[PDB]
Amino acid sequence: EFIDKVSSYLTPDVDIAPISQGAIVFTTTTHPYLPRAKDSHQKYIIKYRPRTLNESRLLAKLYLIPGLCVPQLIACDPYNGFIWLEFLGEDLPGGHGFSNLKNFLWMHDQDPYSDLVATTLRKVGRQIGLLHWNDYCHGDLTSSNIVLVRDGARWTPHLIDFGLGSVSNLVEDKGVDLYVLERAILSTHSKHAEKYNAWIMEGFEEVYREQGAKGAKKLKEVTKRFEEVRLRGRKRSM
Amino acid sequence: MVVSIIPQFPDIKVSLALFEQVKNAKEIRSKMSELSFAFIDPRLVCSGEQMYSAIYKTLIEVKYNKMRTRNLNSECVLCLSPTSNISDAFLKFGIKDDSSQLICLKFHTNTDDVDKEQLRTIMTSIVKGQEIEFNDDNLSRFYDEALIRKIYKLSDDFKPQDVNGLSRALVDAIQLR
Numbered sequence: 001e002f003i004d005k006v007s008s009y010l011t012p013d014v015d016i017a018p019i020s021q022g023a024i025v026f027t028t029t030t031h032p033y034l035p036r037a038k039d040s041h042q043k044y045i046i047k048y049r050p051r052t053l054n055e056s057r058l059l060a061k062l063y064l065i066p067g068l069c070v071p072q073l074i075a076c077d078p079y080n081g082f083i084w085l086e087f088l089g090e091d092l093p094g095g096h097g098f099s100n101l102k103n104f105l106w107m108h109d110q111d112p113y114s115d116l117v118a119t120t121l122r123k124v125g126r127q128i129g130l131l132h133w134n135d136y137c138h139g140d141l142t143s144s145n146i147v148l149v150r151d152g153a154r155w156t157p158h159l160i161d162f163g164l165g166s167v168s169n170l171v172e173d174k175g176v177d178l179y180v181l182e183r184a185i186l187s188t189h190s191k192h193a194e195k196y197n198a199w200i201m202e203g204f205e206e207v208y209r210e211q212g213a214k215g216a217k218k219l220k221e222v223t224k225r226f227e228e229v230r231l232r233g234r235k236r237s238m
Numbered sequence: 239m240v241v242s243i244i245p246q247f248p249d250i251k252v253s254l255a256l257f258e259q260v261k262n263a264k265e266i267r268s269k270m271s272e273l274s275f276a277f278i279d280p281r282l283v284c285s286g287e288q289m290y291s292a293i294y295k296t297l298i299e300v301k302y303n304k305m306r307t308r309n310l311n312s313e314c315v316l317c318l319s320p321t322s323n324i325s326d327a328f329l330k331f332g333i334k335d336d337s338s339q340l341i342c343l344k345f346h347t348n349t350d351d352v353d354k355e356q357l358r359t360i361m362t363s364i365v366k367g368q369e370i371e372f373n374d375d376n377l378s379r380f381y382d383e384a385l386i387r388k389i390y391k392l393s394d395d396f397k398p399q400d401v402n403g404l405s406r407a408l409v410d411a412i413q414l415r
C-alpha cells in the first residue's frame with residue numbers, strides 16, 4: 001500500500017527496509033545519486049510522508065552552525081514527500097538496541113556513575129544548548145530523538161527528527177523543549193532519572209556560560225522560564 | 239569520461255567529462271547555440287557528490303514539477319545554482335571566456351547504450367584542451383572556495399575541515415531548490 005507506492009516511486013533498483021510507520025521511515029543501502037560504490041556509507045534513511053519541507057530546511061540551517069550535530073540532508077523531493085538522510089548510530093552491543101539516548105540509558109541504568117555516562121549526557125545538553133543559543137527549537141525533544149554516534153570509546157550525541165522544529169527566540173519555546181526531554185527521561189521511572197537530567201542541564205548551562213555576560217543573562221532567562229514550565233506542567237488547584 | 243545513472247531513473251544516462259588546459263572557451267561560448275551539451279565552470283564544482291546531487295534535482299524537477307529551461311542539459315546548470323534566476327545560473331555556473339577548465343555534461347534519454355567513441359570524438363572536436371578523469375581527485379584541483387562561498391552565500395563562521403564538509407553545504411543548497 002504505502003510500501004507499494006514507495007517501491008514503485010523508487011523502482012526495484014533501490015532496496016528498502018521499513019523501520020518505523022505511522023509517515024514511514026526506511027533504510028536503504030542505495031545512495032540516491034552517487035554512482036554505485038562511489039558513495040561512502042553502508043546505509044541511508046528514507047523518510048516518506050505522502051513537515052518534509054520544514055525538516056529539510058532546518059537540517060540544512062543547523063549543519064552550518066559550528067558544533068551542532070545533525071544528520072546530513074542528502075536528497076529532497078518535496079513534490080512527493082521524500083527526504084534521504086545520513087544514517088546515524090548503530091546497534092548497541094549485547095542486543096541493547098539502536099543507539100538512541102533512551103536505549104543507552106536503559107543499558108547503563110544499573111551502573112550509571114561512570115565518566116562515560118556523565119560525559120555523554122553533558123554532551124547531550126551541549127547540543128540542546130547550542131540549538132537554543134542559536135534560537136532554534138526542536139519541537140519533539142524525546143530521548144528517542146537524540147542519537148549517539150560511536151567515536152572510539154566515546155559517544156557523540158546528534159539530534160534527529162526536526163519535523164516539528166522551528167526558528168524561535170522565545171524562552172517559552174526553549175523551556176518547553178527542555179521540559180519535554182526532562183519528562184521523557186523521568187518517564188522511565190529509573191531511580192537515576194533525576195541525575196541524568198542534572199548532567200544534561202550541566203551541558204546546557206556550560207554552552208551559555210561560554211558566551212560571557214550575555215550568555216549568563218540569557219541562561220537566567222531560560223532557566224527561570226523552565227522552572228515556570230515545570231510548575232505549570234503538574235496539576236495545581238487553580 | 240564517466241557515464242552514470244540515477245537509481246530511480248534507469249533509462250536516463252548522463253555523461254560527464256573534465257578538461258584542463260582549455261584554450262578555446264571563448265569560441266565554445268560563441269557557438270553554444272548551434273552546436274547539445276552543458277559546459278560547466280569547475281571553479282564552482284568541488285565534488286562528484288555536488289554534481290550528482292544537481293543531476294538528481296534536475297530529474298526530480300522535470301519529472302514531478304516543471305522544466306524552466308530548454309532541455310535537461312541547461313536545467314542541470316540551473317539546478318547547480320542556489321537561486322531561481324536562470325540567467326544568473328547560466329552566467330555563474332557556465333564556462334567563461336577565460337575558463338581554463340570545463341566540465342562537459344550531457345543527458346542521454348535514448349534507452350539505447352551511449353556511443354562512447356562517437357561521444358569522445360564529438361567532445362574533442364568542440365573542446366581544445368586535455369581530458370582528465372572525472373573524479374574527486376581532479377575536481378579538488380580546480381574549485382574556488384572563495385567564489386563558492388560568495389555564490390552560495392556561505393557565512394565566514396562556517397568552517398568545514400575538508401572538501402566533504404564544503405560539499406555537504408552545497409548539496410544542501412541544491413536540494414532546497
Ligand SMILES: Nc1ncnc2c1ncn2[C@@H]1O[C@H](COP(=O)(O)OP(=O)(O)O)[C@@H](O)[C@H]1O
Pocket residue numbers: 019020021022023024025045071085086087088089098144145147160161163
Ligand atoms: N538520521 C537517522 N539515522 C538513524 N535513524 C533514524 C534517523 N532518522 C530517523 N531515524 C529513525 O526513525 C525513527 C523516527 O520515526 P517515526 O516515529 O516514524 O517518525 P518521527 O520521525 O516523526 O518520530 C527514529 O526513532 C529513528 O529510530
Ligand SMILES: [Mg+2]
Pocket residue numbers: 025161
Ligand atoms: Mg524519524
